[PDB]
Amino acid sequence: MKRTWQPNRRKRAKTHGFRARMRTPGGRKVLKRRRQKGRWRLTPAVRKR
Amino acid sequence: AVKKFKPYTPSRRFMTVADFSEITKTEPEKSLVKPLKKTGGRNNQGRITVRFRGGGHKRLYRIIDFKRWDKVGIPAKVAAIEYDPNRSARIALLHYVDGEKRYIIAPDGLQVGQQVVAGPDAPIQVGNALPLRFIPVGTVVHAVELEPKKGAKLARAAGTSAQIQGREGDYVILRLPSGELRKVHGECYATVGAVGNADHKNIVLGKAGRSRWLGRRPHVRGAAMNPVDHPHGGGEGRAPRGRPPASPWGWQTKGLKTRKRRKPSSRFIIAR
Amino acid sequence: TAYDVILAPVLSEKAYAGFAEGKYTFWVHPKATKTEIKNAVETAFKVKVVKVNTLHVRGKKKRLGRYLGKRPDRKKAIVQVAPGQKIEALEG
Amino acid sequence: XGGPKKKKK
RNA sequence: UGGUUCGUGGAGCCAUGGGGGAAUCUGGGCGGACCACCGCCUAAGGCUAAGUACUCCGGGUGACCGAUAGCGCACCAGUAC
RNA sequence: GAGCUAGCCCUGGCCAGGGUGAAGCUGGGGUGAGACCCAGUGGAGGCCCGAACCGGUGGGGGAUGCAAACCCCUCGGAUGA
RNA sequence: GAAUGCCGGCAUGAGUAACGAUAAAGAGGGUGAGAAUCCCUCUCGCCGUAAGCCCAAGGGUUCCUACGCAAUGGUCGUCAGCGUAGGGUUAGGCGGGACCUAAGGUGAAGCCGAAAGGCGUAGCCGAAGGGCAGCCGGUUAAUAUUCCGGCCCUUCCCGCAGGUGCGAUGGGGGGACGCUCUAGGCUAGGGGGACCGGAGCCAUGGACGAGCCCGGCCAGAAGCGCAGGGUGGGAGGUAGGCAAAUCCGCCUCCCAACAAGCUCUGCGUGGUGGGGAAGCCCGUACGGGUGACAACCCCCCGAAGCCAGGGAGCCAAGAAAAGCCUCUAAGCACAACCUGCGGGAACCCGUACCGCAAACCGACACAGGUGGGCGGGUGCAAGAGCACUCAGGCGCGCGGGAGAACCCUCGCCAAGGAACUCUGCAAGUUGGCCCCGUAACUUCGGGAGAAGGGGUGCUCCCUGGGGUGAUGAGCCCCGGGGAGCCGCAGUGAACAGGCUCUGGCGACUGUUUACCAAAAACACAGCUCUCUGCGAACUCGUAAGAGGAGGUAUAGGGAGCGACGCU
Ligand SMILES: [Mg+2]
Ligand SMILES: [Mg+2]
Ligand SMILES: [Mg+2]
Ligand SMILES: [Mg+2]
Ligand SMILES: [Mg+2]
Ligand SMILES: [Mg+2]
Ligand SMILES: [Mg+2]
Ligand SMILES: [Mg+2]
Ligand SMILES: [Mg+2]
Ligand SMILES: [Mg+2]
Ligand SMILES: [Mg+2]
Ligand SMILES: [Mg+2]
Ligand SMILES: [Mg+2]
Ligand SMILES: [Mg+2]
Ligand SMILES: [Mg+2]
Ligand SMILES: [Mg+2]
Ligand SMILES: [Mg+2]
Ligand SMILES: [Mg+2]
Ligand SMILES: [Mg+2]
Ligand SMILES: [Mg+2]
Ligand SMILES: [Mg+2]
Ligand SMILES: [Mg+2]
Ligand SMILES: [Mg+2]
Ligand SMILES: [Mg+2]
Ligand SMILES: [Mg+2]
Ligand SMILES: [Mg+2]
Ligand SMILES: [Mg+2]
Ligand SMILES: [Mg+2]
Ligand SMILES: [Mg+2]
Ligand SMILES: [Mg+2]
Ligand SMILES: [Mg+2]
Ligand SMILES: [Mg+2]
Ligand SMILES: [Mg+2]
Ligand SMILES: [Mg+2]
Ligand SMILES: [Mg+2]
Ligand SMILES: [Mg+2]
Ligand SMILES: [Mg+2]
Ligand SMILES: [Mg+2]
Ligand SMILES: [Mg+2]
Ligand SMILES: [Mg+2]
Ligand SMILES: [Mg+2]
Ligand SMILES: [Mg+2]
Ligand SMILES: [Mg+2]
Ligand SMILES: [Mg+2]
Ligand SMILES: [Mg+2]
Ligand SMILES: [Mg+2]
Ligand SMILES: [Mg+2]
Ligand SMILES: [Mg+2]
Ligand SMILES: [Mg+2]
Ligand SMILES: [Mg+2]
Ligand SMILES: [Mg+2]
Ligand SMILES: [Mg+2]
Ligand SMILES: [Mg+2]
Ligand SMILES: [Mg+2]
Ligand SMILES: [Mg+2]
Ligand SMILES: [Mg+2]
Ligand SMILES: [Mg+2]
Ligand SMILES: [Mg+2]
Ligand SMILES: [Mg+2]
Ligand SMILES: [Mg+2]
Ligand SMILES: [Mg+2]
Ligand SMILES: [Mg+2]
Ligand SMILES: [Mg+2]
Ligand SMILES: [Mg+2]
Ligand SMILES: [Mg+2]
Ligand SMILES: [Mg+2]
Ligand SMILES: [Mg+2]
Ligand SMILES: [Mg+2]
Ligand SMILES: [Mg+2]
Ligand SMILES: [Mg+2]
Ligand SMILES: [Mg+2]
Ligand SMILES: [Mg+2]
Ligand SMILES: [Mg+2]
Ligand SMILES: [Mg+2]
Ligand SMILES: [Mg+2]
Ligand SMILES: [Mg+2]
Ligand SMILES: [Mg+2]
Ligand SMILES: [Mg+2]
Ligand SMILES: [Mg+2]
Ligand SMILES: [Mg+2]
Ligand SMILES: [Mg+2]
Ligand SMILES: [Mg+2]
Ligand SMILES: [Mg+2]
Ligand SMILES: [Mg+2]
């Protein structure tokens, strides 16, 4: 059947990107938490040009 | 007149379509004056706030003239009468000698080629606009302003009118389509005649689809729902209500008057 | 800084085949435009540059057990020389 | 799995 | 209405949203309703070290652990997944 | 978190081939003028058969499966909500 | 020593079930330490509106090649999509950006909110929509509308030559639009050919024959030629298009009413360029040579594609903005703009490979899911259906034997035909087309494919219409009539309704419990009640605000009933 993962580079970027997270206090805290944690990747890596 | 069909299909046996014979050879509209992009959307910034809206034909807005006092004294020739997707009435395309082209909402009896004009001057004829005062008591009228210089707001639906009843210092009394008795300021413009396309009420949609074409989504009964959804939801195999009939939001829907009492508008109203 | 643009030449059975024609092809700085790439190979070889073609070459994911990484991203430019000229330093 | 089936039979 | 031990209690004091609305030393607040007496203070402007809290970081010590323990990680771990 | 799913918005795409034959046109007939009737034309429709396509009726298989909803036969719609 | 305890390790069932579609394999020869499994040849089977090609998304080295087999491969493995190394992705014209605007997002002004923040005309952002200049071949092991060859365009900038009041983010025009059906002429694609060109081939009884087999194009500026799309030309008056206009708009007189004329496309032709089979000979893991001086012509069918902004009809009444044309304002008219010709300048990112799948979404080399374009030939009425088959691609990554029960999937059956059973569940009968022929009832449409029947192949003769051709030969479509032939059987295979009568419920097409319920539930047109005079009622939000609605009682919100008839 159709599963739940339907990859889209634009969606992933607009949805979970560094700039989206930065836009709101909710998201800014996510970066803070991930930084303090020592996460190698703050936001998902969306590729291609 | 109303177009009628033979039952060559079920739902074609009741279906019924407007007569478009008053639609003069001018079916597609007029750029310049209108159209605008019209912005379909069944809801506010976010959430739906009027249920069951959506779908249905794309539209172009015809930006019509609801304040006729710009062109006081300037007459215009009625050039055409065309279909307007965004109202029950039809619209008149008129050419002002000025050059300017406006649409007026098209009254019953309006003929193409006719002369029409607005102002204190203005022969009392079908199509003309006047401040309410100079209009003879008892004449039927439409596109009436509520307060002066604020635009036509009463009687624009197809086949509607108001009748002038009498006067009272600065106000003339109106009898509105609903039957209400209203004091409306003398200085309010209103155009003589009834609205026309009066056979609009006689049309039978005929099937579900037609409803959808006009963007009317299926309306579901409270009875059909559940207690979470509606006061009428549940219980077992059908149910008669079990309380005084209500809206989904709990207010009673048979009888409960809802106009606020202390409206300052009150001292200008005399009926139902 | 013009000997900063051009890094090294590309050595391969394909780069050479551009020596019959006037297409000398070098690795370049990833951030360098066709237009500064011309102005560079001109002054460094005193040659009339007529066509610049550039392409990105993506780095290779190589692994050395447990430790997996990626090589540096490079860029190629293959540059066309006006009729008759040659870049002697590549003619090997 | 996570069910979600209701106890039928 | 909040604060104080104070949950309307005899409920003061200290803050305040609403209404009314003074006075300049013979002026004003308080000492638990209120009044008298006797006393303590001088509101509606602001700044002020130190003593106190903490431990990302550096150092010392341990009737603290010794690789299923001790931090999640003694090992390229907030990694692989 | 609406990359699954529900709805709506904006903008594009898709629907083989067959049937049936409304209005309306044209001619003829009829009448004081009509209504209406015959052809011929016409090509209407949440119209019909039926692929793609969207489904999931009934039965069988499958049940540590090919598969955490599949497969075979059969079946609903398929110019419209 | 226990907590269906926690982590780890190893047992049991067990050499048991399984090894992922029943599309299918056999052999010879290689290579190798080692071959059912790798390479090659021959034979066989399968897909072919694909199981074949080309994109988009997504994936990110999987591409090519060299050397390799510990693991990954459900077996093997000399192979690989795996390991090590190296090589590979070339653009002014394709796509995206130095262009535009949609929903929506953001957001100066401004409004609101304990804070965080929420709204918000202008503007900006925002795309398979608008705008925009490359076609055909040739090369690599791997890239090509990118490199190369030919032919053809686009912008800027600087020049000369000449034309004109030039000239704005501003005005106007245009761009610019629905659904259904469609006409004319073309192209793509396809069939045929006694004509043109070809290596060859007479087999096994017969055939040296207008014999068999293979192939008979593509691109192409200017100029033509043929289709067709756009569009009236004047002169006056002017108060409107938010300044100004000669422009547009509105009046009034002339000439046109025609596509005559201007332009704009499409298609043919075109200077020239390129391609160019079967077969045979070679060595590949494949490509090459020859066939060639290859020929490269005539008919026929013909689009859903092009001319395109074509035409007709209908109601539900069908984006914007910029490029483009034009008008003027500030300015400036030694500027500037336009035409022509020259030289010069033309960036950034993408390009490999998979792409109905072993490379994407499903923990897997997973029988599932996945958007667009091409999708040949024959026959069956047609068709993207169905059977076989071009090109192309595969035999699905365990095999070999055996011929028990039992299961799955399928074929057939004496006599009876539902006696089976909760139920004819299942399976069968029926089945396509053409033509007779059709009842109750009916809202006059329907019920109707009612039911029930007959015809269906092949041969010969006669003959009626078209279509393309000139009024004809041919080639292509529909027909009619008459004799006759064979078989058990003529939609001889494949695809293709069982029917009728009578009740209940729901009017009907529809919708619904993704993953046990598709229904008599929901919806539905329609009927009624009620609310609401517009800063409407109602709804969301603390508010601002927004929906309702740029609607106005024939309107909008709520409730019930649910076509229609009688009530
Ligand atoms: Mg416009
Ligand atoms: Mg909201
Ligand atoms: Mg938002
Ligand atoms: Mg309902
Ligand atoms: Mg329910
Ligand atoms: Mg409730
Ligand atoms: Mg009951
Ligand atoms: Mg109830
Ligand atoms: Mg590039
Ligand atoms: Mg308290
Ligand atoms: Mg006090
Ligand atoms: Mg005190
Ligand atoms: Mg005391
Ligand atoms: Mg004190
Ligand atoms: Mg110890
Ligand atoms: Mg140890
Ligand atoms: Mg540890
Ligand atoms: Mg640990
Ligand atoms: Mg007729
Ligand atoms: Mg039809
Ligand atoms: Mg239908
Ligand atoms: Mg069907
Ligand atoms: Mg469903
Ligand atoms: Mg014990
Ligand atoms: Mg257990
Ligand atoms: Mg264990
Ligand atoms: Mg056993
Ligand atoms: Mg056994
Ligand atoms: Mg077994
Ligand atoms: Mg297998
Ligand atoms: Mg070997
Ligand atoms: Mg086959
Ligand atoms: Mg790799
Ligand atoms: Mg490979
Ligand atoms: Mg193995
Ligand atoms: Mg496997
Ligand atoms: Mg090898
Ligand atoms: Mg490899
Ligand atoms: Mg382009
Ligand atoms: Mg730049
Ligand atoms: Mg923009
Ligand atoms: Mg906008
Ligand atoms: Mg905002
Ligand atoms: Mg942009
Ligand atoms: Mg575009
Ligand atoms: Mg000018
Ligand atoms: Mg404009
Ligand atoms: Mg012989
Ligand atoms: Mg040509
Ligand atoms: Mg003006
Ligand atoms: Mg050849
Ligand atoms: Mg048209
Ligand atoms: Mg703009
Ligand atoms: Mg302009
Ligand atoms: Mg490429
Ligand atoms: Mg490619
Ligand atoms: Mg390739
Ligand atoms: Mg596809
Ligand atoms: Mg496999
Ligand atoms: Mg698969
Ligand atoms: Mg599909
Ligand atoms: Mg075809
Ligand atoms: Mg057929
Ligand atoms: Mg098929
Ligand atoms: Mg029997
Ligand atoms: Mg028998
Ligand atoms: Mg019998
Ligand atoms: Mg029985
Ligand atoms: Mg029995
Ligand atoms: Mg029964
Ligand atoms: Mg059955
Ligand atoms: Mg029955
Ligand atoms: Mg029945
Ligand atoms: Mg029903
Ligand atoms: Mg149904
Ligand atoms: Mg279910
Ligand atoms: Mg079911
Ligand atoms: Mg059903
Ligand atoms: Mg509003
Ligand atoms: Mg509105
Ligand atoms: Mg209502
Ligand atoms: Mg009901
Ligand atoms: Mg009911
Ligand atoms: Mg009922």
UniProtKB/Swiss-Prot annotation, chain A:
InterPro entries with a match to the protein in the record: Ribosomal_bL34 (IPR000271), Ribosomal_bL34_CS (IPR020939)
Any single Pfam family the record assigns to this protein: Ribosomal_L34
GO cellular component: ribonucleoprotein complex; ribosome
Gene Ontology molecular function: structural constituent of ribosome
Parts forming coiled coils: none
Keyword Iron: no
GO biological process: translation
Transmembrane parts of this sequence: none
Region ranges (Disordered): 26-49
Biased composition (Basic residues): 29-49
PROSITE patterns according to UniProt: RIBOSOMAL_L34 (PS00784)
Keywords: Ribonucleoprotein, Ribosomal protein
UniProt keyword annotation of Ribonucleoprotein present: yes
Disulfide bonds: none
Subunit structure: Part of the 50S ribosomal subunit.
Family designation: Belongs to the bacterial ribosomal protein bL34 family.
Record's function text: Found on the solvent side of the large subunit.
Extra information: The open reading frame (ORF) for this protein is entirely within the ORF for the RNase P protein (RnaP). The two start codons are separated by four nucleotides.
Protein name: Large ribosomal subunit protein bL34
Organism name: Thermus thermophilus (strain ATCC 27634 / DSM 579 / HB8)
Swiss-Prot record, chain B:
Keyword field: Ribonucleoprotein, Ribosomal protein, RNA-binding, rRNA-binding
Residue ranges, compositional bias (Basic and acidic residues): 229-239
GO biological process: one example: cytoplasmic translation
GO cellular component, as recorded: large ribosomal subunit
Compositional bias ranges of the Basic residues kind: 256-272
Molecular function, one GO term: structural constituent of ribosome
Region described as Disordered: 222-272
UniProt KW Oxidoreductase keyword: no
Keyword DNA repair assigned: no
InterPro entries: NA-bd_OB-fold, Rib_uL2_dom2, Ribosomal_uL2, Ribosomal_uL2_bac/org-type, Ribosomal_uL2_C, Ribosomal_uL2_CS, Ribosomal_uL2_dom3, Ribosomal_uL2_RNA-bd_dom
Signal peptide: none
Alphabetized Pfam families for the sequence: Ribosomal_L2, Ribosomal_L2_C
Assembly notes: Part of the 50S ribosomal subunit. Forms a bridge to the 30S subunit in the 70S ribosome, contacting the 16S rRNA. May also make transient contacts with protein S6 during translation in the 70S ribosome.
Family in the record: Belongs to the universal ribosomal protein uL2 family.
Functional note: One of the primary rRNA binding proteins. Required for association of the 30S and 50S subunits to form the 70S ribosome, for tRNA binding and peptide bond formation. It has been suggested to have peptidyltransferase activity; this is somewhat controversial. Makes several contacts with the 16S rRNA (forming bridge B7b) in the 70S ribosome.
Protein name: Large ribosomal subunit protein uL2
Gene for this chain: rplB
UniProtKB/Swiss-Prot annotation, chain C:
GO biological process: translation
Entry-linked Gene3D superfamilies: 3.30.70.330
Domain of life: Bacteria
Keyword Nucleotide-binding in annotation: no
GO molecular function term, any single one: rRNA binding
Keywords: Ribonucleoprotein, Ribosomal protein, RNA-binding, rRNA-binding
Gene Ontology cellular component terms for the protein in this record: ribonucleoprotein complex; ribosome
Cysteine pairs bridged by disulfides in the record: none
Matches recorded under InterPro entries: Nucleotide-bd_a/b_plait_sf, Ribosomal_uL23-like, Ribosomal_uL23/eL15/eS24_sf
Pfam families the UniProt entry points to: Ribosomal_L23
Entries under PANTHER family matching the protein: 60S RIBOSOMAL PROTEIN L23A
Family the UniProt entry places it in: Belongs to the universal ribosomal protein uL23 family.
Assembly and binders: Contacts protein L29, and trigger factor when it is bound to the ribosome. Part of the 50S ribosomal subunit.
Function, in words: One of the early assembly proteins it binds 23S rRNA. One of the proteins that surrounds the polypeptide exit tunnel on the outside of the ribosome. Forms the main docking site for trigger factor binding to the ribosome.
Name of protein: Large ribosomal subunit protein uL23
Gene: rplW
